[PDB]
């Protein structure tokens, strides 16, 4: 966040509408909020909007200010779970992180043990925040969500950031988030929702509702790496967020030190207590696998360092001990070294950062479509920064499995990119106070910049309409407006993109209807530009539209005939008038 915003072309110097921005309330459903964080400072803030109706649960060591003007909790079912606390207070850290990502104010020198140093901020530092705590160690219940929504709607929230939801895509018909968001939409309130972290398989996203803006997690240029240097003098580049200073320690293999009743067939991975604690103490264990902080304590208490392995390393995480996830080969290279001189040694360095030019690429865990409820309503809808995002953290909240004196943490997930979209959507809202949820969501989609299908073969079912563009989202020129009155043919649903399910090698011919509403003051003509593959034929009538002014609408029909042989084939439509550009992806699937 000390870097994502700049990576999105959203500088500290972007123009603002401070007056409207300061009167906007961003409701955040998550694990609560930690009031004390610098990201939620009050200084200078005028008093809350007169038309705000929310309140604050201040009977248990919590206090709202003029930044955080609302805070409530929901555990309707049974009693509070173990380790949790009564009230709006965030003890998990998830809600605090999320809130600062979307609306956190400027905090300089923001850093996690030096890592990611910079100026932390939210997309809208002046908006007010209203926290609705609905997630516990107990989980997040359906009753709490519906209830929290109700309050948000009546309190007067303007937009809602929802970083929860990952149920089996097939349980989509019994998902409450669709109920809440729907009622929210009827009152002109948009919802940003993380797609899920169940990728990369072809049908892992559970954020299926149409009125819901779904967001996937992509990378940014900045990348955390941890250099490991074994005895020979050769280095390897591993990923992890290592805050421990550079140190040197003896090396050992999991196979060489099995534990009573274990075979080296499981010791390799040194998991499930398959390693003798005695011959492990004070050394950097080398294991053929990748596990979390829990397994560190469970199986490796005593070890001074850990070296893991994985074929996937497009994101980093912090651990309880000097650690680093190496590439399969660099691992074998390290193992040989162990059986070489017999008395090895490696030095795990404190993480550093490289710049990856391929970014933004949607990360591996990001849930991807098609929409299991309707393959013709493509999802995700868009992408944003969700890998290694540094933002506000509670002082009591553990980091990577231990305690660290830090006010910021670095974590990844679709729940990190959602807040980004939430903040950007609020920004657009500050400039276009009257647009509806579908209008705001359209702006961000039609104005998103195209992503590379060579990096993410799944095309749209991985990044939807592409990567967000904050400043172009403000003046989209035209919008695919809608409202609950339209969710009562699927291909004729005024969506910002087009989808179509087909059978392998089987000529087809579909047609789609849409209506664009102008949001720009000046009249202008928008000629159309298509870009379809080979085995397909696409056209649009009209292919030229004029708009006399603000409000005017026009329709058109898109036809798609052809026959794809592969799984996913994409094309695009674009309605430019010179100044404005309005692209809408076109996806065809063989499932
Ligand atoms: C700069 O960022 C890019 C984007 O994340 C890094 O490229 C990715 O690196 C990961 C990590 O190893 C690769 O993961 C393996 O992926 C394969 C196949 O799945 C991937 O590729 C196919 C075809 O392109 C797609 O259909 C999939 O959606 C997916 O993208 C899988 O079998 C393995 O089990 C791993 O999961 C990933 O493929 C790769 N994606 C892209 C777009 O290239 C890049 O990492 C470098 O390049 C990769 C290929 C490895 O050689 C890494 O070791 C390199 O570091 C990163 N570069 C730097 C400097 O960090
Ligand atoms: P986010 O990515 O939220 C999803 C589970 C919806 O989760 C964090 C804890 C990584």
From Swiss-Prot:
Annotated glycan sites: 356, 513
* Localization per record: Secreted
Modifications made to the protein after synthesis: The C-terminal propeptide is autocleaved.
Tell me which residues make up the Peptidase S8 domain: 4-474
Q: Which GO terms describe its molecular function?
A: serine-type endopeptidase activity
Temperature-activity note from the record: Melting point at 81 degrees Celsius.
What are the GO cellular component annotations? extracellular region
UniProtKB keywords? Allergen, Autocatalytic cleavage, Disulfide bond, Glycoprotein, Hydrolase, Protease, Secreted, Serine protease, Signal, Zymogen
Q: Which domain of life is it from?
A: Eukaryota
What family name appears in the similarity comment? Belongs to the peptidase S8 family.
How does this protein assemble?
Monomer and dimer.
- Spell out the protein name for this chain: Cucumisin
Source species of the chain = Cucumis melo (Muskmelon)
Q: Which residues of the full protein are shown?
A: 111 to 730 of 731
């Amino acid at each position: 966040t000390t870097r994502s915003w700049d990576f999105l072309g959203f500088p500290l110097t972007v123009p603002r509408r401070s007056q409207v921005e300061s009167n906007i309330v961003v409701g955040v459903l998550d694990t609560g909020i930690w009031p004390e964080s610098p990201s939620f400072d009050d200084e200078g803030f005028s008093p809350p909007p007169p038309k705000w109706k929310g309140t604050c649960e201040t009977s248990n060591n919590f206090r709202c200010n003029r930044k955080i003007i609302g805070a409530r909790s929901y555990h309707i079912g049974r009693p509070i779970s173990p380790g949790d606390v009564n009230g709006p207070r965030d003890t998990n850290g998830h809600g605090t992180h999320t809130a600062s990502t979307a609306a956190g104010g400027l905090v300089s020198q923001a850093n996690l043990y030096g890592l990611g140093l910079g100026t932390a901020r939210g997309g809208v530092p002046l908006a007010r925040i209203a926290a609705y705590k609905v997630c516990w160690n107990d989980g997040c219940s359906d009753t709490d969500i519906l209830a929290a929504y109700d309050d948000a709607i009546a309190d007067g929230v303007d937009i809602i950031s929802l970083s929860v939801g990952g149920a089996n895509p097939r349980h989509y018909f019994v998902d409450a988030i669709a109920i809440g968001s729907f009622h929210a939409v009827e009152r002109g309130i948009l919802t940003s929702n993380s797609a899920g972290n169940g990728g990369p398989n072809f049908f892992t996203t559970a954020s299926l509702s149409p009125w819901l803006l779904s967001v996937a997690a992509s990378t940014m240029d900045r990348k955390f790496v941890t250099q490991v240097q074994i005895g020979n003098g050769q280095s390897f580049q591993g990923v992890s967020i290592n805050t421990f200073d550079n140190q040197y320690y003896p090396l050992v293999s999991g196979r060489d030190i099995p534990n009573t009743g274990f075979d080296k067939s499981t010791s390799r991975f040194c998991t499930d207590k398959s390693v003798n604690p005695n011959l492990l103490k004070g050394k950097i264990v080398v294991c053929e696998a990748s596990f979390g902080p829990h397994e560190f304590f469970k199986s490796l208490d005593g070890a001074a360092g850990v070296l893991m392995t994985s074929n996937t390393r497009d994101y980093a995480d912090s651990y309880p001990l000097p650690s680093s996830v190496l590439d399969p080969n660099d691992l074998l290279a390290t193992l040989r070294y162990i059986y070489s001189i017999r008395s090895p040694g490696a030095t795990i360095f404190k993480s550093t950062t490289i710049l990856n030019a391929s970014a933004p690429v949607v990360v591996s865990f990001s849930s991807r479509g098609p929409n299991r409820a309707t393959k013709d309503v493509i999802k995700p809808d868009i992408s944003g920064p969700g890998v290694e995002i540094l933002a506000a953290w509670p002082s009591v909240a553990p980091v990577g499995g231990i305690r660290r004196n830090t006010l910021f943490n670095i974590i990844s997930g679709t729940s990190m990119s959602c807040p980004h979209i939430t903040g950007i959507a609020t920004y657009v809202k500050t400039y276009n106070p009257t647009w509806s949820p579908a209008a705001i969501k359209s702006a961000l989609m039609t104005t998103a910049s195209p992503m590379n299908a060579r990096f993410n073969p799944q095309a749209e079912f991985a990044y939807g309409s592409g990567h967000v563009n904050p400043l172009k989202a403000v003046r989209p020129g035209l919008v695919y407006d809608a409202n609950e009155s339209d969710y009562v043919r699927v291909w004729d649903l005024n969506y910002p993109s087009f989808g179509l399910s087909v059978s392998p090698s089987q000529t087809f011919n579909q047609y789609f209807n849409r209506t664009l509403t102008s949001v720009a003051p000046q009249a202008s003509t928008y000629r159309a530009m298509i870009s379809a593959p080979q085995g397909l034929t696409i056209s649009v009538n009209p292919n030229v539209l004029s708009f006399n002014g603000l409000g005017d609408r026009k329709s058109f029909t898109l036809t798609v005939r052809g026959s794809i042989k592969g799984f996913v084939v994409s094309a695009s439509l674009v309605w430019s008038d010179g100044v404005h550009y309005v692209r809408s992806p076109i996806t065809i699937t063989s499932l």
